[PDB]
C-alpha cells in the first residue's frame, strides 16, 4: 500500500530495515539503493543482496549509487559493522539478486518521475549524497515525492561525536541539501532510536521464530550487541534503522515535534550537528520535524511479524 | 567563611546576586569587579554601585573591568534590562560608594595572588572578558583560585541563538579562555537556570518583608517579569545569577554532571555554544561540570533569608 | 582537431569565447553547456542560442545544466551583464538553434564515455557546477578527459571580494570538487585575465571586418566596456573567457606555472579563494597550473581570424 | 629623537635589529619588551639580555611579556633559529642587564600614559600578544601612540604557510585586534623583507668594521644564512626585522601603499593571512598601508653606520 524506496548502507541494522520492509504488508518496496556510509560502496551492494537473498525477495531492483561523499573525504564505520559491514556472515558463491544496470540516482530520478506524483516516500537510513545528487540533478522529484523519512540526526544526542550523528557527519553538505529543500522531513534521529533497545526477552522472541532469515537477524544482533557492550557503551544494541521503516507503516509508532533543523558545515566542534530550534513562539508552517518518543513495544511487535510473515522462503 | 570575588554587569538578575551574596552570612564578598555585557561598562558599573548604597554594603571595593570583548564587536542586552541596564530605577544625586581605582583585572591578580592558595572563589555572572583577561596576565592565579563557578551557557539550552547562551556568546573567545584553563569549572547554565521562576506566591513573600532593598528587588523583578512573559517568551521570568552564588553557599541546591565542555569558536549556526560531551565511557578527572537540577524551594529560602537579614539600613 | 566542451554562463565575455571557438580551424565544438552564474540558468541558456545563431553554428547541440550552486545560495552578476546578461541585445522571434533534450550533466556523460580516451578537454568559463556534478555522477570520466581548461580564480587577485574570483566563489564547493579530482587542470585566472584589455585599436580592428558577427561583438564590448569604466574600474575591459579556449587552440599564447592549487571553503574573508603556494622546493608532479603572462597581439590576432573565417552567414 | 618601544622576540634577526636601534643617532630606545614566537618567553628573553650585553646598553629597560598566545597554543621556530633561539652563541655567566620587575603590558602602559601624546611609535618584530594585551588593558594607549610600525604579514606571500608569515598565525587574534584599532599601522611584511638579503658583499663590508658586536653578527648571520640556504629555500637569509627599526629611522627606505588590511581568523588554508584589498576605487582615509620596495642600498648603509657607531665598549 505504501510505495517507498530503501536508500541504506548494509550494515547491521540496515539489514532488519530491510527484512521488515519486506516482511509488512503495508509496504511496498520500489527498489532497495545503496550508498558508502557503514562500509564503502562495494562492500555494502554485496551486503544488500546477501539479506535480499536471505529473505527471499524477488522483483526488487538493487542499485548501487555514489561511492564518496560529495565533498568531503571517505568516512567509514568498519569498527561498528565489521570489515565485511555485514559482521561476520559467510557470503553465497553466486548471488541469486544481481545489482542494477542503472545507477540509484538515476534509478530514484526515474521511479520518481515515471509515478503519479505524491506517491512514493524515501526512506534514507544512510548518508545522503544519492538523495541530494538526484535532488539537484532533477529539481522536479521534490515537489512529486510524498515525504522523506530518514534516521539520522540527534538534537540533543551525537555518536560520531559528542553532538553529531554519523550519518550526517560523512557528508553534511549532502545533509544540508536534503533539510533545506521543501520536500517534508521526518528526522528519525538518535534521541528515538536509542529507545529500540534489543534486549534478551526480544532476541528470545526471535530465537522461537525459527526460521533461517531470523537465525540470520539473531547472528547479526548477536555480533552488534557485542560492539555496542564494548566499543559505544549501552547495556544493550540499538537498532536505528528499522524505526524509520516502522514510522512509515505505522505513525503511531513514536510521537514527533514540528520544529526547524539545519545542518552545520563550518564548526569546528559542531561539524555535522542537526541543529534544532525549540524555542517557543513556534514557527507554525515548518517541513521538518524530530521524532521523540518510541511505543518499545509496537515497534519490536512490528518486527517481530514481519519476521513471521517472511516465514523460510 | 567563603570568601568570593563577584564578577558580574549588573542588569536585573545580577543586582538579585548581590543581594543575596551581601545577606548570606556564609559569604564573604571580597569585591564586585564589573564588565561589559548587558549594558556598556559605565551604565552597568554606575548600577552596580545603585544596588552596592540600597544594600548598605562597606568596605567592599567596586572596580570597572574591560569596556570591550577580546576580539569581537561590543554587543549588548538593553532590549531585556532597559536602557541604563538597571531597568526603571532612578539613580542618586550621589553614591556612597565610589569606583575604586584600580583596574578589575588588576584588582582580582592583586587579590589572588595576596591570599592564601585556594581561598578564593571565582563567581562571573556577565561575559567573561575580565577572568580571561587576569589569567593571560598573571597565569599564577589558576592554580590559585579555588574554582570558578559561573553563571552562563547551556548544554541543552541557548537564548541569544538556539543553541548559545548571551553570556558566552558576547566574547566566545574568552570563555574558550576559561573552559580550557586547568582550574576547576561549574558552569549554572540555562538549562538549570530556567529552574529559578520568580512566581507570585515568590514574590508575595518578598513584598512581606517590607524593607527597602525588598521594596527595590520587587520593583526591579516586576520589569523584569514584563519584559520575559513579553520578549522571550516564558510565565514568569528567569532569575539566572543567584543561582551561581546560591550553589557557593550550599551545593545541595543543585545537581550537577561531571562531563567535558567547550567553546564552539567558528561555526556558522553554533558559535558561542558550550559543547558537553554526554556519551558514556564518561572521561573521569574531568575539571568541568554542569548544572542539572535545583531544589527550588531551598534555593528561594537562601534569597529571602538574606532580604531579611540586610534589614533596613 | 581539438574536441572541447565549452560549458559556459552566456554573459559579454562568454559569448566572445564562442565566436573564438566557433570560427577558429583548431577547436572542433562537441557540445555548448550551460550553467548558473552571471544570470540564472534560463537567460544564459537563451544567451547561448542567441550567439549560437549569429554565429551560424549548427550540428552543435546545446544543453542546459544545473540551475543552482551545489549546496550555497544562488549568487548572480546581472550589474556586470545587463538583466538579460547579454548586456543590451534584442533577442529574435524565434531561435534556429534549440536546446537539447538531456541534461548537460548527462550530455557531457555521454560524450567523454563514448568517445576515445584522452581526445575531449573540457572548457568551462562559468561556475563549475556542471563539471563537479559529472565527475560525481560517473567518476570515469576523470581519466577519460584530455584535460581541463577553465576560466577561474585568481592567485593574487580577485574580483567578487579582495581574494576571490566570481566563478569560483558562486560554487566553491564544486570548485574544490574540479580543482582536488587528479585529472590536470590549467587554471587561466583574473592574474592572466586582467591582460587580456580590449583597447580602442583593438575595438578599431573589430569594427572593420564588418560583418553581422562582428557588429554584434562591437555592440557588446561597447557595454562590457562602459561597466568596467565605472563599476569595477579599469581604462579597458578586460575579456577574460576567450583566453580559456586561446590556451586551447594554441597554448603558446601565455606562460603558465606548475603549482598547488586548492580552494578555501571556510574562511571569513577568504572564501572562494584558490590558494597557490609558490614556495620554493617546488613540488614537481602536480596536476595544477596557473597561467601568468599574455602575449597580447597573438592573443587579439585569433580572436579577428576567427571573426573574419565566421564571415557573413 | 625618535622615541620607540621595541617588543621582540629575540631570534637571529631581531637581534640585528637591536643593534641597529641602538647604534643609530635618530632612534631613542625607551624600552626593549618581550613576547613567545621564535622560541619561548624565557629563552627570547635570555637573548635580549645577551645582545643587550654586546652592543653595551645602559638605561634601558628590558621586561618580559606574554608567554603565550591569546587563545591558540604554543607555537615556537626553534628550527630556524635554533634552540636557544640565538642559534649557536654561548652565553656569559651574568648578564649586566637584568630583566625589569614590570610586567611588559604594564611597562608599555605606563611608558606611553606617562610621557606627551604622539611622541612614542610601537616596533614589534614578533607575535602581537603583548601589544594587543596592552591595547585592551587600557584603551587610551591608542589614541598617544604615534604610530605602529611592525615587521609582519605579507600581502603576496607567506613563510609559515603558503600564505601567512609566521608573526602573525602564532597569534591571530591578537594581530586581529592590532590592525582593527584606529591607530596608524605599518605593515613591513615579507613582500618587503625577502628584498633585505644578507650577500656575500655585506657580509664583507661587515666583518671589515671589526670590532666585537660586529663579530657577533657575523656569527649569528652566519647560522641565519646556512638555515635559509637549506631550510626555507633562498640563496642568501633575508633579515627581517631592522627593516622595521629603518623605516622610523628614514621613510624614504621604502615605498608603501595606503590600502585596507584585515586578519583572517577561520579560513583553513588562509588562517593568519593579511588580507589587503588592491582592488581599485581605494579608500582614500585608510589607517593601515603595506611596504613595498626597498632602497637596499640605504638599508645597509643604516646597519653599517650603527655598527661603526657602537665601536667596541
Ligand atoms: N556506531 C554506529 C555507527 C554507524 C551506524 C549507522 N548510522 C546510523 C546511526 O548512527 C544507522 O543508520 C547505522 O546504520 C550505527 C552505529
Ligand atoms: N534576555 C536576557 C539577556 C541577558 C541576560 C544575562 N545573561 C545571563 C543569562 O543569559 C545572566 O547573567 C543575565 O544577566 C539575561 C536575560
Ligand atoms: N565583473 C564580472 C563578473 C562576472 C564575470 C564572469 N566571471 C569570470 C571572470 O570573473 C568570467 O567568466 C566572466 O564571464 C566577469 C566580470
Ligand atoms: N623562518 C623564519 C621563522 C621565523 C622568523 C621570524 N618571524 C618574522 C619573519 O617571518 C621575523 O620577525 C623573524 O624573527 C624568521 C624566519
Ligand atoms: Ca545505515
Ligand atoms: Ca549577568
Ligand atoms: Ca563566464
Ligand atoms: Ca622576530
Known amino acids: ?95 541469486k539478486n544481481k545489482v542494477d544496470e542503472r545507477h540509484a540516482v538515476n534509478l530514484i530520478i526515474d521511479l520518481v518521475m515515471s509515478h503519479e506524483p505524491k506517491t512514493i516516500t524515501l526512506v534514507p537510513t544512510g ?20 515525504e522523506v523519512v530518514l534516521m539520522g540526526g540527534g538534537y540533543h544526542e551525537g555518536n560520531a561525536t559528542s553532538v553529531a550523528e554519523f550519518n550526517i557527519i560523512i557528508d553534511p553538505e549532502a545533509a544540508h541539501i536534503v533539510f533545506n529543500e521543501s520536500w517534508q522531513v521526518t528526522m528519525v534521529g538518535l534521541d528515538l532510536t536509542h529507545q529500540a533497545l534489543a534486549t534478551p526477552p526480544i532476541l528470545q522472541r526471535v530465537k522461537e521464530v525459527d526460521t533461517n532469515p531470523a537465525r540470520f537477524m539473531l547472528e547479526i544482533m548477536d555480533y552488534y550487541t ?45 561539524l555535522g550537528m542537526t541543529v534544532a530550534d525549540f524555542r517557543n513562539p513556534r514557527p507554525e508552517h515548518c517541513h521538518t520535524q524530530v521524532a521523540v518518543k518510541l511505543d518499545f513495544e509496537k515497534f519490536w511487535g512490528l518486527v517481530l511479524d514481519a519476521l513471521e510473515r517472511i516465514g523460510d522462503p
Chains 1, 2, 3, 4 share one sequence.
Do not use: W
Not at 27 to 46: D, S
Not at 67 to 87: C, N
Not at 127 to 145: C, F, H, K, Q, S
Open 127 to 146: 548518508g545522503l549524497t544519492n538523495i541530494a545528487m538526484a535532488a539537484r540533478l532533477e529539481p522536479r522529484i521534490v515537489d512529486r515525492v510524498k
Open 226 to 270: 557485542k560492539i555496542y557492550q564494548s566499543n559505544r557503551y549501552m547495556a544493550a544494541a540499538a537498532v536505528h534503522d528499522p524505526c524509520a521503516v516502522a514510522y512509515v507503516i505505522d505513525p503511531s509508532v513514536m510521537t514527533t515535534e514540528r520544529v526547524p533543523v539545519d545542518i552545520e558545515l563550518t564548526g569546528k566542534l559542531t
Open 1 to 95: 500500500a505504501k510505495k517507498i524506496i530503501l536508500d541504506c548502507d548494509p550494515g547491521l541494522d540496515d539489514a532488519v530495515a530491510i527484512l521488515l520492509a519486506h516482511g509488512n504488508p503495508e509496504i511496498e518496496l520500489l527498489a532497495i539503493t545503496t550508498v558508502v556510509g557503514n562500509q564503502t560502496l562495494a562492500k555494502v551492494t554485496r551486503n544488500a543482496q546477501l539479506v535480499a537473498d536471505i529473505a527471499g525477495i524477488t522483483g526488487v531492483p538493487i542499485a548501487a549509487g555514489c561511492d564518496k561523499p560529495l565533498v568531503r573525504k571517505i568516512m567509514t564505520a568498519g569498527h561498528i559493522h565489521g570489515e565485511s559491514g555485514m559482521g561476520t556472515v559467510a557470503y553465497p558463491a553466486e548471488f
